[PDB]
Structure 1
Amino acid sequence: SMKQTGYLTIGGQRYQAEINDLENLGEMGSGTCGQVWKMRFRKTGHVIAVKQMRRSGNKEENKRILMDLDVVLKSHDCPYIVQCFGTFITNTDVFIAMELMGTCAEKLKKRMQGPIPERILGKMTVAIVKALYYLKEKHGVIHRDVKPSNILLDERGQIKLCDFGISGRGCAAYMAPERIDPPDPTKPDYDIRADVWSLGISLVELATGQFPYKNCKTDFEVLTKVLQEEPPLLPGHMGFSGDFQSFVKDCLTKDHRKRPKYNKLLEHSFIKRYETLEVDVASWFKDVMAKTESPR
């Protein structure tokens, strides 16, 4: 069992450590200053993310950080969920040391300014489905907020579900029909199928480089399109495999009673393919970052 405070376990090795052992390399991402830091563990050279939860901080927020951390700590055996290396507890702060990902899919799309290849999305789909399934099966957690910002990638070619909100209960953009409008009054609660829909939308957005409801000027207009319009499917003339089109058509079934749960999606040929097909996500990632690098 991982040493949950005063230690960092990284690689397979446990290191006694404390906050002064980390060099602060600044905000982990744009406007993350004061709260999530990129830091270098001086003893090993590892560069990690450190979330700083101030004791004086917002209480609801700290409650969510703690719930999410509880789930991350008990998700040590899931390869598809970002890992906690350890924590440091001082009189004024908790520092939560996390795996450092390069970017989320939302920032990746913004930086790319175009379609993300099918092969990359195949590996992504496998990782995220397996992460969501693990969460529900092991921890009883319905994620409730699947979208590109919660899908993380790195230069090692790993693709993992973000810790943010990973404990479950704008991005109304990704809301399933039945979540917008529970078709049964007497049994109103959406379930994991609503996250399936969100995954489908996310895939189409990433595959095309266009959010499927882009021409909407208000959040409510987007909800009206989700309900009134045919599900926004993959185009037929971008060379997408029939497996990918099917996978997405399945995820985007409007009638949630006919939409696959994770168990069923894990049988899909799209997933079976990308479980075993070798895809060099690492090289791809490094290449596209290099091609889109702005001078310092």
Structure 2
Amino acid sequence: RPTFYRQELNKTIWEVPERYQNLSPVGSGAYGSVCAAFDTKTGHRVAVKKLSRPFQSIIHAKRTYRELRLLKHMKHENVIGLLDVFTPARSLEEFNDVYLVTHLMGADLNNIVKCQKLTDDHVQFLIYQILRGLKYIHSADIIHRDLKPSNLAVNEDCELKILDFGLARHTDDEMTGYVATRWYRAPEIMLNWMHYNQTVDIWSVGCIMAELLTGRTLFPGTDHIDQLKLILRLVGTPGAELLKKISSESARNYIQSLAQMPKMNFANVFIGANPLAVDLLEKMLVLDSDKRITAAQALAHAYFAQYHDPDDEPVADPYDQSFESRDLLIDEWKSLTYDEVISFVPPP
């Protein structure tokens, strides 16, 4: 057991192992409080997150377990990993506080591309890395659900990691009106058409790749309905085959009220883009999610010829998510979380 020290940071008590020095607040949210620190054990600059009210309800205690299980599992170059997890408690009886440690991230994709377009070579490398990370995530039957530029960290060498997985239901208010939180969402999840699956992430990659090529948001809708009209104008109104797969009767009736439109010519929309970039966008931005290209298929597309290496695109160890259908008490989720904290093995 390391020695812990206490200090108060912006009306918040922090009790952390001595290895973590020079803590300074970086962010605050509903989820918790975040400090930058220097890790004397590894020489890395790190983010330390103190979870807020981790065991306040069953909903909160289950979210805390979900987040720790997910971060402990993810071991890939293009995905955020867990450097450390600690509690000051010396027993389950006094356990209340959970702290998560990850590599400090300097810039997100917005910081390299806010109101700006990039070279084709930069777009190839950046989208290759997202898909390498998604092949790994999807091989464990994990759906990210919230891919957008602010959830992608990038360094001065254009190296990229995926972070901030979807682990809480987003609030109704958070998805309302002119907001980046909805611009990257697949239509089937934005409007609750049907049970969604991992193909929602590929729709988000199509929206990010379009915005790197043009320097403009692809579908910046002022609300859910405006955003759907922008989508259907590019990819066309749905045929009978997709209309059948929409479980909601009222969602089906609403779509049928719209005048029919054909799919546009993507070479006339993405003027001057590499023809291989236009071809891959037509394969991602498909309205019927059954027909979209998968991350494993996209890695073999000619657009990535200079980066693709089928001996260095690894898959994940199996991930058990059976806990998600388990009905447990607060103290039972808390005990499961405690065991996961004490069994943590640091990376080499």
TM-score, length-scaled by structure 1: 0.72
C-alpha displacement of 1:275: 3.1
Change in Cα spacing, 1:20 to 1:220, as seen in structure 2 (3 Å) is farther
For the pair 1:67 / 2:54, whether they are aligned, the reply is no
Q: Deviations over 1:216-272 (max 9, x none)?
A: 43343113322344378574444x322222111211122333211222212211233
Cα distance in 1 between the residues matched to 2:291 and 2:31: 44
The residue number in structure 2 matching 1:141 is 142
The residue number in structure 1 matching 2:274 is 241
Cα distance in 1 between the residues matched to 2:302 and 2:208: 19
Cα distance in 2 between the residues matched to 1:178 and 1:165: 16
The residue number in structure 2 matching 1:108 is 112
- Cα contact 1:25–1:40 (8 A) shared by 2: yes
- Cα contact 2:48–2:99 (8 A) shared by 1: yes
C-alpha displacement of 1:118: 2.6
The residue number in structure 2 matching 1:208 is 214
Cα distance in 1 between the residues matched to 2:22 and 2:165: 21
Q: Deviations over 1:23-48 (max 9, x none)?
A: 24423358799612211113454201
The counterpart of 1:250, out of the listed 283, 298, 304, is: 283
Cα distance in 1 between the residues matched to 2:45 and 2:51: 19
What amino acid maps onto 1:153 in structure 2? V
Please give the secondary structure, in 2, of the residue aligned with 1:200. Answer: helix
Please give the secondary structure, in 1, of the residue aligned with 2:112. Answer: helix
- Cα contact 1:6–1:86 (8 A) shared by 2: no
Cα distance in 1 between the residues matched to 2:185 and 2:37: 35
- Cα contact 2:51–2:99 (8 A) shared by 1: yes
- Cα contact 1:27–1:34 (8 A) shared by 2: no
The residue number in structure 2 matching 1:293 is none
Which segments of 5 or more consecutive residues in structure 1 lack a partner in the other structure? 8-17, 277-296
Please give the secondary structure, in 2, of the residue aligned with 1:275. Answer: coil
- Cα contact 2:31–2:51 (8 A) shared by 1: no
Cα distance in 1 between the residues matched to 2:231 and 2:103: 35
The counterpart of 2:99, out of the listed 95, 100, 107, is: 95
Count of equivalent residues: 252
Cα distance in 1 between the residues matched to 2:166 and 2:186: 18
Please give the secondary structure, in 2, of the residue aligned with 1:51. Answer: strand
Between structure 1 and structure 2, the one with the greater Rg is 2
Cα distance in 2 between the residues matched to 1:264 and 1:87: 35
The residue number in structure 2 matching 1:177 is 187
What is the aligned-residue identity percentage? 25
Q: Deviations over 1:147-203 (max 9, x none)?
A: 1122121235421110432799933322223334576xxxx2222222111110111
Change in Cα spacing, 1:58 to 1:212, as seen in structure 2 (3 Å) is farther
Please give the secondary structure, in 2, of the residue aligned with 1:80. Answer: coil
Which segments of 5 or more consecutive residues in structure 2 lack a partner in the other structure? 4-15, 90-95, 176-180, 236-262, 310-348
- Cα contact 1:67–1:167 (8 A) shared by 2: no
TM-score, length-scaled by structure 2: 0.62
Q: Deviations over 1:62-113 (max 9, x none)?
A: 643542331221222x221111111121244222110222222134333xx3
Change in Cα spacing, 1:58 to 1:35, as seen in structure 2 (3 Å) is farther
- Cα contact 1:71–1:166 (8 A) shared by 2: no
The residue number in structure 1 matching 2:84 is 86
Please give the secondary structure, in 2, of the residue aligned with 1:120. Answer: helix
What amino acid maps onto 2:162 in structure 1? L
C-alpha displacement of 1:133: 1.8
Cα distance in 1 between the residues matched to 2:101 and 2:133: 20
